[PDB]
Structure formats: structure tokens, C-alpha cells
Amino acid sequence: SGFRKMAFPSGKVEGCMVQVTCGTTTLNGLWLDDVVYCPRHVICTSEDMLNPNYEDLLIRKSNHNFLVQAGNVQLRVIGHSMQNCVLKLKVDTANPKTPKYKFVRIQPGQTFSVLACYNGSPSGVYQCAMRPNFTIKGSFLNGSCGSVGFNIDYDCVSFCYMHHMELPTGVHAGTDLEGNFYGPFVDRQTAQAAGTDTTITVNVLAWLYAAVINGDRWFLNRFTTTLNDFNLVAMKYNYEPLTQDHVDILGPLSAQTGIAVLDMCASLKELLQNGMNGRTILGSALLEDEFTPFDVVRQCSGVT
Amino acid sequence: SGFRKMAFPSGKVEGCMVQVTCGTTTLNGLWLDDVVYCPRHVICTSEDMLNPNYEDLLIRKSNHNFLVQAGNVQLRVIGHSMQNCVLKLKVDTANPKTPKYKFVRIQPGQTFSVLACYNGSPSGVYQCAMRPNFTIKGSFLNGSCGSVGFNIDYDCVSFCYMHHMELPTGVHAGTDLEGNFYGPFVDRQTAQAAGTDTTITVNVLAWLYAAVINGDRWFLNRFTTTLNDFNLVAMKYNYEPLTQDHVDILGPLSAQTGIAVLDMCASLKELLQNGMNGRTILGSALLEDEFTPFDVVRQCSGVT
Ligand SMILES: *CC(=O)N1CCC(C(=O)N(C)c2ccccc2)CC1
Ligand SMILES: *CC(=O)N1CCC(C(=O)N(C)c2ccccc2)CC1
């Protein structure tokens, strides 16, 4: 028992982190096979970032300008191309530690682990969620750009995120591994405000199931609700509307605990309308929304 | 910017996890050099655990009874000995992936990362603290025993914890790597209740500094306090008494932010006496105490 915010083991991704330098700028790169992926803003100067024309700035760069270092050994760059907002630096050596991998584009509500790196060196690992406004609440300093978000399915790493920007409100923006930003964010230093940060309703319900499974049951009540009734309450509190897909996705947890999804919705409805009353659920004083139903199932069963 | 509960990169420790089986029981073992460390309760049957005489149960076991498997390759056991509550299985092969390491016994308030494993396979990584009552709030299922807690100082892993028990209240107990349990817990299925779970005051103050550094400043007030006055309030709310050592330990953070430690104590005093008033600090609705001043400094600067 016990339920914790748990990141995937980072070993497989640590073996992929390299340091990329272009001029005065040093950020991280992901080394898979003979390609190093990194944010294209590595070629910008602090002046360029205000309004950069990346195709133009890239014409001024050659293979030898991209300094790629894996630990203390330098990698030879034999090609360079821009794919959307990432650079793909072809190296002469395939990464011997390349795990089995996929590049996936996740949806908001989906969670992943971030291996925070600086100078191609990993510093820590934490669990994030792609927020419904396509931002992530990360922990990234200068030098952390190029750090990746991933999920692991047994031995295959599904890379979903690469860090690019910090919005002036402290939230983070980045791309999938094809260089397409999540949401409307651009790799430009401009006025990009994040939209409403809605709460991931299905994730809160999943975490309520995790709590019942681990002994925290005080919030269970004698009520039920409907999807439409619950949604009126979810609307009021800036929660994602609950769909029959989310109800179906919650099925395995409903089955295991014996609590119908709509009854758990009525518990969540009461928690929204009345607060926690100074109580906690899984050691938290607010409704946690960065555990998916799959994360709850994984942790509650011990998937490796 | 952004502050997250961050675990150390788990790569170095993943390469040490092995599966240990003794009879019907399968748990995890730590493979460093030619020794595999595992909880001594691996030799118990569910009947034995009520009142086990480990020296007696161990006489019935030989080197060939300890089945040690690293991935799909079996390790030959050439020796076995009991050190306090852990078994040390000498193998014929030194772990090629043995990182630089230390075995350290941490104090309560100190934090570490747990690589949760099942059948010698890592499932996830999360950050814990050794609670002042010598328990940890982990996430461990059956099969997770033998999972370790660690800290990393550049390339040296300091192993501090090995999982052994789950108390009937959902909290966890284990040993350092010399087999000595933290606190008064024993590897016996008996009535072991955890003591008062006091809040790690110095860690809360450190996390308040992390919050100011990242933009959350609403809780800052026009008050100050003394160590003795603050301690009257800390006593009332089951907080650890603040010492001049903790004030000194907070020095670097006080210096960086310009907020005197005692002024931050007065902010913490007001938060204790008045609550958060439905507000949050670093995305949390309660006072976080599992970030040490060193963790705040590390994350706020990007130590790899
Ligand atoms: C996220 C990251 O690693 N980086 C973005 C900020 C950047 C930096 O420190 N400065 C000042 C800069 C350089 C070039 C272009 C814009 C801003 C380091 C890399
Ligand atoms: C923590 C851990 O991995 N283990 C302790 C519980 C144990 C188990 O499932 N049972 C039923 C058991 C076996 C032997 C002795 C006591 C309890 C699996 C290992």
C-alpha cells in the first residue's frame, strides 16, 4: 500500500542525454540511433529570440558549429536539419545505449516523467501532466531546455515532450519529438499567456479510487449523480467535462473497488462544493489531477 | 523556475537491482561488487514472520537455496551471511554496473529517492523523507521489499534505505544497508505502532524559501519572531522544534532571498495559526516538509 507521485525509472533516458552547444548557447539533446534531437532555439542569441527567422539563422550554421558531447567524448556531426521547432543533428556514431523507442504526441490529461538535465547531465526526475491548456508545470532552469518527457512500456520508451520555453507565469511549454509545440506556443520571446488551467476530472476520479484502495475513505458519501449533473458542478469549478469515455476508462477501478463511477463523481461533487474541511486525501490537501487511471492501475498492481 | 518533488536519476541504482528468491518468497536485492544485499525475511514463510528466530531459520538455508537473478542471467551464490536484518549473499561475479557508492545512515528529516522494484525490475522512482518517527510514507506492494532509498553526490550513490515492512497504518519501515532498522521497528509481524508524525520544520522553511524564489510570496508578512516564540507555536502544531543549527542551515537561502530566517518563521507561524485560506504554495494546499534546505538549493541551481 501507499500511493506516491512516481516517475518512471530514468536509466534508459539518461543514456540518451547529450550536451549541445551552438555559439554561446548550451542546452540538452536527445541521442537516439545516429541522430541528436534538440530545440532549434540553440542557434539563437538572446537578441534573436525576440523575432527569429529560424531558416535564416540556420543558413549561418554548419555541421561543425554544433558541438555535441556525450559525457567527455565529442560526437562528430555529419548532418543537420530542421523539423518544425527541433534540430536533428545526424552524428557518425549510433548511440550504443539507444533503448527501444517511439515518438508519441500525447493529449492533455496524459502524464509523463521528465528527466531534468543541465549540460547533458541529468539532475532529477519528476512526474508531469500535459495540462488542458497545453502547458506543463515543470521545474526548468536555464540550461534545462532539451530535457525530455517520456513514458515506458516495459522496454520501449515513448518520448512525448522536449522542453523549450518558460512562459512569464512560471509554466512550461515544449514540443513533441517531431518539433510541434503542444498547444499554441511558439519558440519566440513574445506575449504568450496560458489559457485556463482546468482540472483533469478523470485523473481526480482515478486518484480518488487510488485513495479508497489505500484506506482514505472519509470522502465517500451516500450520494450519486449523473454525467450531466456532475458536469454542471465541474463547469463551475473549471474541471474538464466528464465523458462516457472517461467513465469507461475508469471501469477497471470501479470494478476493483466496488464503487460505481457516478457514485465517486458524487463524492468529487461534494468535495468541490464543500472543500476538504482541513482533511487530507493521500497526504494531499487539494484534489490531485496528475495521476491517470492507467497510472493508478500501474502503481496499485506493480507494473515494471 | 518551477519547483517540483524531484527524485534523483535512477539509472545508477537500476543497474544494481536483482531478484532474490528463497523458497516461495521473491523480493529485491541490491547488487554491489560481488555482494547482493536483501532483507533477511526472504527466508521466512508467512507463518515464520509472527515470531521468527532468524539464526535458526538461516541454518536450514544453503548458498544454493538463494536464487539470485539479474535480468535473465542467474548469479552463482558462493557465500551467505546475516548482518543485523539483511542478508549478504556473496556472488562469484562482481556487478559490472556497480557505481561508486557509500552506505550511509540518515537522520529523520533527511530525504532520499526510492527506486520501487518488483522481481528485481524497477517500476518507478519517487522522493521520500525519513519521518521524525523513523517511518517513511512510501508506495510498496508485495514483492517491493529489498527496494532501496538513495542519494547521489555527482557519481557516488549513498544508499540509505532498504524496504522491509509495512506497518498496519500504511506507513513503511526499513533498514540502512548495514541491516539496522530506522527507529524501533522489527522485521516481525507484531503490534508496531508508529509514533507522532511531526512536521519537519526546517524542511517547511526551506520549501517556503523555494516558493518565494519561484514567485509565490502571498504568505510573506510584516512580522518576525524568535526561536523560542516560534517553538511554542511549533509545539502546538506537532512541528519539530527549530534549533540554531536549522537557522544556520537555512543561511544560504536567507542570503539569496533577503528574507531573514526568523521573518520566514513568522510567516510559517501565521500559516499555522490561520491556515492557507484556500490558497496554495508551490501548487500545494498544505505545508510541504519533504524538501531539505539542500534539496531546495540543488533544484534552484541545477546540480547534476
Ligand atoms: C531553456 C534553456 O536551456 N535555454 C533558454 C534560455 C537560455 C539563456 O540563458 N539565455 C539568456 C538565452 C540565450 C539565447 C537565446 C535566448 C536566451 C539558455 C538556454
Ligand atoms: C515486502 C515484500 O516484498 N514481501 C513481504 C510480504 C511477502 C508476502 O506476500 N507474504 C504473504 C509473506 C511471505 C513470507 C513471509 C511473510 C509474508 C512478500 C515479500
UniProtKB/Swiss-Prot annotation, chains A, B:
Positions bearing the Glycyl lysine isopeptide (Lys-Gly) (interchain with G-Cter in ubiquitin) cross-link: 5, 90
Topology Cytoplasmic: residue spans: 1-304
Effect of residue 142 to A: Does not affect ability to cleave and inactivate human TRMT1
Reaction catalysed by this enzyme: TSAVLQ-|-SGFRK-NH2 and SGVTFQ-|-GKFKK the two peptides corresponding to the two self-cleavage sites of the SARS 3C-like proteinase are the two most reactive peptide substrates. The enzyme exhibits a strong preference for substrates containing Gln at P1 position and Leu at P2 position
Regulation of its function: Inhibited by pyridone-containing alpha-ketoamides compounds 13a and 13b. In turn, alpha-ketoamide 13b (tert-butyl (1-((S)-1-(((S)-4-(benzylamino)-3,4-dioxo-1-((S)-2-oxopyrrolidin-3-yl)butan-2-yl)amino)-3-cyclopropyl-1-oxopropan-2-yl)-2-oxo-1,2-dihydropyridin-3-yl)carbamate) inhibits SARS-CoV-2 replication in human lung cells. Inhibited ex vivo by michael acceptor inhibitor N3. Inhibited ex vivo by compound 11a and 11b.
Active site, per annotation: 41 (for 3cl-pro activity), 145 (nucleophile)
Record text on subunit structure and interactions: 3CL-PRO exists as monomer and homodimer. Only the homodimer shows catalytic activity. Interacts with host FBXO22; this interaction promotes the proteasomal degradation of nsp5.
The protein's name: 3C-like proteinase nsp5
Gene name linked to the record: rep
Shown residues in whole-protein numbering: 3264 to 3567 of 7096
